[PDB]
Enzyme design. Sequence first.
Site, PDB file in Angstrom:
ATOM      1  N   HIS A  82       4.046  -5.199  10.044  1.00  8.46           N
ATOM      2  CA  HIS A  82       4.658  -4.767  11.284  1.00  8.46           C
ATOM      3  C   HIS A  82       4.801  -5.820  12.365  1.00  8.46           C
ATOM      4  CE1 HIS A  82       4.292  -0.384  10.454  1.00  8.46           C
ATOM      5  NE2 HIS A  82       3.284  -0.735   9.662  1.00  8.46           N
ATOM      6  N   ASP A 116       5.662   4.261   5.244  1.00  8.50           N
ATOM      7  CA  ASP A 116       6.478   3.225   5.863  1.00  8.50           C
ATOM      8  C   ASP A 116       6.496   1.969   5.002  1.00  8.50           C
ATOM      9  OD1 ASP A 116       3.686   3.196   6.792  1.00  8.50           O
ATOM     10  OD2 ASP A 116       4.309   1.562   8.123  1.00  8.50           O
ATOM     11  N   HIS A 117       5.715   1.901   3.930  1.00 14.75           N
ATOM     12  CA  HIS A 117       5.765   0.767   3.013  1.00 14.75           C
ATOM     13  C   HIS A 117       6.281   1.161   1.624  1.00 14.75           C
ATOM     14  CE1 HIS A 117       3.582  -1.757   5.868  1.00 14.75           C
ATOM     15  NE2 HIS A 117       3.176  -0.571   6.270  1.00 14.75           N
ATOM     16  N   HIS A 120       1.089   3.880   2.036  1.00 15.62           N
ATOM     17  CA  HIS A 120       1.630   4.494   3.251  1.00 15.62           C
ATOM     18  C   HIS A 120       3.149   4.542   3.173  1.00 15.62           C
ATOM     19  CE1 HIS A 120      -2.354   3.758   5.588  1.00 15.62           C
ATOM     20  NE2 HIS A 120      -2.463   4.674   4.625  1.00 15.62           N
ATOM     21  N   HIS A 161      -8.004  -0.888   4.852  1.00 16.14           N
ATOM     22  CA  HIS A 161      -6.956  -0.084   5.480  1.00 16.14           C
ATOM     23  C   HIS A 161      -6.628   1.058   4.525  1.00 16.14           C
ATOM     24  CE1 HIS A 161      -3.448   0.788   7.891  1.00 16.14           C
ATOM     25  NE2 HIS A 161      -2.692   0.796   6.795  1.00 16.14           N
ATOM     26  N   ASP A 212      -0.616  -4.057   5.817  1.00 17.39           N
ATOM     27  CA  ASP A 212      -1.315  -3.590   7.010  1.00 17.39           C
ATOM     28  C   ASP A 212      -2.761  -4.077   6.998  1.00 17.39           C
ATOM     29  OD1 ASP A 212       1.110  -2.404   7.679  1.00 17.39           O
ATOM     30  OD2 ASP A 212       0.397  -0.350   7.755  1.00 17.39           O
ATOM     31  N   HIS A 252       0.836  -1.203   0.000  1.00 17.95           N
ATOM     32  CA  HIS A 252       0.000   0.000   0.000  1.00 17.95           C
ATOM     33  C   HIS A 252       0.871   1.254   0.000  1.00 17.95           C
ATOM     34  CE1 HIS A 252       0.482  -0.748   4.328  1.00 17.95           C
ATOM     35  NE2 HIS A 252      -0.159   0.359   4.667  1.00 17.95           N
TER      36      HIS A 252
HETATM   37  C1  LIG Z   1       0.919   4.540   9.152  1.00 20.01           C
HETATM   38 AS1  LIG Z   1       0.072   2.816   9.594  1.00 20.01          AS
HETATM   39  C2  LIG Z   1      -0.502   3.128  11.479  1.00 20.01           C
HETATM   40  O1  LIG Z   1      -1.265   2.406   8.523  1.00 20.01           O
HETATM   41  O2  LIG Z   1       1.402   1.582   9.813  1.00 20.01           O
HETATM   42 ZN   LIG Z   2      -0.510   1.367   6.709  1.00 21.54          ZN
HETATM   43 ZN   LIG Z   3       2.351   0.305   8.070  1.00 18.79          ZN
END
Ligand SMILES: C[As](C)(=O)[O-]
Ligand SMILES: [Zn+2]
Ligand SMILES: [Zn+2]
Lengths: 260, 260
Positions: free
Chosen positions: B173, B58-59, B56, B110, B134, B54
């Site tokens: 995660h 962090d991915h 986001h 998500h 996620d 996705h």
């Molecule tokens: C930025 As998230 C809380 O969807 O890992």
């Molecule tokens: Zn995410």
């Molecule tokens: Zn994430």
Amino acid sequence: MKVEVLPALTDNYMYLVIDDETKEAAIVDPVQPQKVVDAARKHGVKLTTVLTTHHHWDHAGGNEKLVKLESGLKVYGGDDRIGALTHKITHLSTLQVGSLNVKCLATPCHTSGHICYFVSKPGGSEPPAVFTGDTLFVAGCGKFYEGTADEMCKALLEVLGRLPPDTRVYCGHEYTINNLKFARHVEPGNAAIREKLAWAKEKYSIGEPTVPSTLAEEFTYNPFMRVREKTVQQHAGETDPVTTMRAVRREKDQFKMPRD
Amino acid sequence: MKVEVLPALTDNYMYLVIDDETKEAAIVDPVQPQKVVDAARKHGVKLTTVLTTHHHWDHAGGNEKLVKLESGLKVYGGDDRIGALTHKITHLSTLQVGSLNVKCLATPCHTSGHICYFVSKPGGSEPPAVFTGDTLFVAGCGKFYEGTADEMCKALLEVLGRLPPDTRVYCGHEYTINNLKFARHVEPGNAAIREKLAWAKEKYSIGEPTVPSTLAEEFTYNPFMRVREKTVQQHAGETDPVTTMRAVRREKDQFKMPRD
Ligand SMILES: C[As](C)(=O)[O-]
Ligand SMILES: [Zn+2]
Ligand SMILES: [Zn+2]
Ligand SMILES: C[As](C)(=O)[O-]
Ligand SMILES: [Cl-]
Ligand SMILES: [Mn+2]
Ligand SMILES: [Mn+2]
Ligand SMILES: [Zn+2]
Ligand SMILES: [Zn+2]
């Protein structure tokens, strides 16, 4: 002092507060004004004051109209969003309704401008009254639309909680039965909850309001008023009233109401 | 196939999916590109593909930089917001990584463009793998930022839930301990949860990832995968998986994590 309970809308309560001495009266949250004027005529009193607990339409929505039906009205409230407001008041502001003394208590949380009105007869021997709008309900409390758990803790325990125990509580809505069904879930071993619920179901059964209650009574069965009690804290899994308040309010918000 | 779990940031996981045959590899969510490059070099393999679960950061946040460190990369994702895409895929899109087969599974919720990647080797001499970003975590799921409970129900029980039970689950995660602490609260009588929690705590202590789990295991301890179970529905006060899903997710959103 006389307090006449006036149902409005689906489950709102308006309150005609009468000074016996002068026949002057105040109306709390007059959302259905013709109903207020009829009650005022029926009791032969002179309406001079409006006491608005908060700006939510179900409480203040009739102010504009009532002011067009009755001239001379002083419209009190602690929030600029309240229609037809004439007298903006704050924590500890005081006013008089004939011989009655009214003390304004700011209880921000449900809304930031929420005011509860504490009404008493100076020298009188009759118990006082507190109009709590959507801050304190019988066995419940309002959702925290514009505030925090800390604010509701202060409102309930430090502001309303320090009023005399015999103070009569006249709240914004008829939510008593559901409030007690939630209270029963929080403290299954508390008999005051169970008996107050039996009583409320019976009142409901005969078309009578569950107000007023008294502050001493709320301390016996209202989970929000009891956030300092170890039983309520243990149910929430917390050890201080503010975090217990937060947890119990969130829990109530997602609680599915049982059918009995 | 060989899956190399690569920790990134504070609790993210990137996955280097190695085709031991052609020595070609794909990287799942390459947020720390240089780390990816070293891993590929340590394993003597040629990076050819990027699979993005996705958008986001962090991915997908390292996609542009990775493409700048490595040429000829094919970059897959199911959302326009993903950087450096070369191929936009959708539900049931297929591709190959060396001898490996990859099947894209759309799991909107998500994020609307979230994709889970199902990797398998023909003539199943080994269990398949699903990279779930996620959407599905070990004992948990992602917050519903761009979708509904109906959508997560489908994603988890129908799209992922119907994959082979031995499929390995490689999620975005390291949230396992906290996920199981919440799971324990939903189902205090579930032994699979308390056993997995004890194990997760030990893996955390020795610095080992809790991935991968298997879909079969997830069905024994993940409250979101267990929304059809009477115990989970009773906790939520509901009697259907979709309203249970909504209630369990809302509850976890505001759940206070206990110390143990
Ligand atoms: C930025 As998230 C809380 O969807 O890992
Ligand atoms: Zn995410
Ligand atoms: Zn994430
Ligand atoms: C739920 As209300 C509109 O009576 O504060
Ligand atoms: Cl709960
Ligand atoms: Mn509960
Ligand atoms: Mn719970
Ligand atoms: Zn209100
Ligand atoms: Zn109201």
